[PDB]
Amino acid sequence: MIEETAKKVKELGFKKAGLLATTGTIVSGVYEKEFSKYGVEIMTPTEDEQKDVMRGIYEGVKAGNLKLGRELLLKTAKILEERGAECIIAGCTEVSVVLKQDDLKVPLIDP
Template identity: 40%
Template structure:
């Protein structure tokens, strides 16, 4: 959720298994179960959120039979359903917002700008975790939410060039508010965000990949 972000997460986990955990031979790579669930779009409109939650809960129940060591959601917006999914799961979920807020704190950033889907922002999943870590945050202006929805929709549709300039403009507006780093709080955004931005950038897809691998290899 979405497909390109999920594919990139898998590839990133393989790359990090090599670079950070020394995987060389086939048996040293993590066992990964990928379940790409075609839930209806609810990153900008919550009208379909109940249907999406129902589908995800059903899928978690089915995945329980495979006895995973943990679950991960390759979608920040889907974390708005996390409390419902945790009730069904027989293994813990690795939470992107929680892990990201910890990483922000670890790297010493006191004030960050958050780029995310409107539904994610309105639900407050990141704001809560930032506050728990004592981190100040800046959100996009209300007039930029529609543009963020357009950007995410374009990436899901396979368009990677057109959204880049629009996303950069929003990031620059956060930069003007004296943030110390940018958090890409949607797993589609790292696919189009510039690699050499003038501020530190926290890629939540990478943060999730590292957290899942740490749990797999170290049980932490």
């Protein structure tokens, strides 16, 4: 659950979490909402970067082009990280397929 992820992130003392998920999810703003209830901030990529996250999930992972998915998702995760994310949230299972903890400096958490 999004709310359980939020409490866990808060319990780890993190104030800023990076999010890799679908545009539908980011537009609903459900993560920012649930995380705000625990005082935690959600970091999302720019609108163009978000399009590449979408490509990474669908044109990449879901389509079978695992190389492309890894490339685009890893790059986005590394960008959120470099920007200050204390943890990266794998919002879609496709993210966890090509992105693993050994790829990041910060915790990779999935629902």
